[PDB]
Amino acid sequence: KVCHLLEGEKTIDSVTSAQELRGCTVINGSLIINIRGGNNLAAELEANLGLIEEISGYLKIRRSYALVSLSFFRKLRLIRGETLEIGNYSFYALDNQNLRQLWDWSKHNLTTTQGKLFFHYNPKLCLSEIHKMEEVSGTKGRQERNDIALKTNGDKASCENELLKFSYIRTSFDKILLRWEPYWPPDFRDLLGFMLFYKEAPYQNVTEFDGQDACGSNSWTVVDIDPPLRSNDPKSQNHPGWLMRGLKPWTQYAIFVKTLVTFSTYGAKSDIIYVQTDASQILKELEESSFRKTFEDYLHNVVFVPRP
């Protein structure tokens, strides 16, 4: 059904506010989102907002600490700019603190039909996503004076990382052994670890940030992994790996692996691979590793003396 927003300018700020929008094929007027928390969410934002395909007004997302991906707007494909936010914006992401995925542009064809784009703060969100949107959404081609800032966007985010290939994928009915390529940052001690992700996933349409929010709902069975014992010889860097345990027979897992790397940025991530088997505290750990790196670097700087 069509949803004329009687207030014209609806905010969604919790699950119970979105349920007003259940079954909205299109939304007249603008939307703001400020979704900031939730529990055992059961994808309840996706269900209410998934149907929406066309938004007449602008789309504003602000302060929205819980949301990590905007893929809950499963069918969203058109912002019309028939009511621009001041500054003539049609999309406006301000201070989304855990927003990591704007949209899966491979499967998303959203066109913000009129007015500019806006992106400020959103540290987790990558400039790559932002640039993809402005070209997917016509704005940059349409010479929209998009207000996206290099500073404060993509900061504190492992964006634009290298690809990891999987080299080895050996299964059993209940365990899978993987090895991916060796990856090392320019300084190998910046590899604090890898982190595998896996998800029993019957369909090959999975996305990294799907089913995920920063309020602690997470569909991925993340498995952090110690760094491998490095070789001096680069041609003797063994392919690191993990034997992920406790699987179910003849079930297709979506899997990827990603580097855990201390900022000096330098990191890598695999694609999602599908394998059918067979029929904060974190800042303390990122400091501790950075501290032992610091000491070691100090010791070297002190013990090794250049002869005059």
């Binding site: 050996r170 299964t171 059993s172 365990k175 052994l177 090895r179 110690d226 491998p228 014992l229 063994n238 392919h239 690191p240 790996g241 034997l243």
Partner: peptide, 19 residues
Amino acid sequence: XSLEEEWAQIECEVYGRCP
């Protein structure tokens, strides 16, 4: 090898943890 045994061998080869 077995998947488990090979992984342990790989772990010793890679991470240095050997049974």
